[model samples]
Target: MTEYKLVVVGAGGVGKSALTIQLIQNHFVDECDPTIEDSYRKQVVIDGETCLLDILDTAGQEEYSAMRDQYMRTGEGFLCVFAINNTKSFEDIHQYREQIKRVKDSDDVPMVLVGNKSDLAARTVESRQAQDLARSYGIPYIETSAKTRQGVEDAFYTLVREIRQH
Candidate 1:
């Protein structure tokens, strides 16, 4: 079986655990801890093809930066999350990219930029801004909602597809 290792990284409260659970089990876990050194695994079958997903939902808190980097280095792909309602999260995309760059040797690694909390569109951080930043970094950007399931599956699929290409 082909196994994929994906690591999620970003600032605290950006909903990395929410998205991770939603992707793994098709469910959102509210008020869950921010993945302090936690790891989980799940499997997905697409068109009769099975893929094992080894996920490292690294802590989003700044205090765990080094630990987060250690986990990210083991990943085959990365899902860099940011809350759409939080401008600071959006602004930190560059730092997040740098974190990935630190461990990733080739610029060939696929980095996915996910803008979370799409359900609260009123406070949207502007998807275009995220997309523009992602473009500047040469990575694909997608806005996802674990609560309403909007673009949730698409986000995972996009990253998986990119991983396959690489």
Candidate 2:
């Protein structure tokens, strides 16, 4: 129903790894900041209308950190992904959210709290861990698995839906 620029933001090595294809294999807001190794674009009909979605899969190299702030400012929506098995990645969610707020220069922005790597049975981050925080931020939370590609469509679609509302 609307055009989208969905940036996938998260800490290193998590399942910030695969949900992209899970959806478009099914979706960058791509402008600068290293090219898309984990990013790309596509048009998918989600609600009765065909619209464009660009996935800016940000690869945090830890050197040119300034690239994050620049492209982060241009994206329309973000999928703040973390691995379900990694506690620190989950803990890092707030900083990502906080930074996006500063980059977008607003308290309220289009985002979806995504817990990737649901395929791992030994999950460290309880599902509810993100639930409570997501509510506090007024964002939706969804779990995804790059292995099975479950919830891939849900995470990205809900983001654009959020963007449309915003």
| CA lDDT, candidate 1, residue 23 | 81
Off by over 4 Å in 2: 26-39, 63-70
Best by lDDT: 1
Candidate with top TM-score is 1
- For model 2, state the Cα shift of residue 130 in Å: 0.9
Model 2: per-residue lDDT, tens digit, 28-99?
111233434444778888876799888877876654655455568878999998898899998998998998
Which residue pairs come into collision in candidate 2?
A: 28-54, 28-55, 28-56
The regions of model 1 sitting more than 4 angstroms off are 61-70
> Cα deviation in Å at residue 85, candidate 2?
0.7
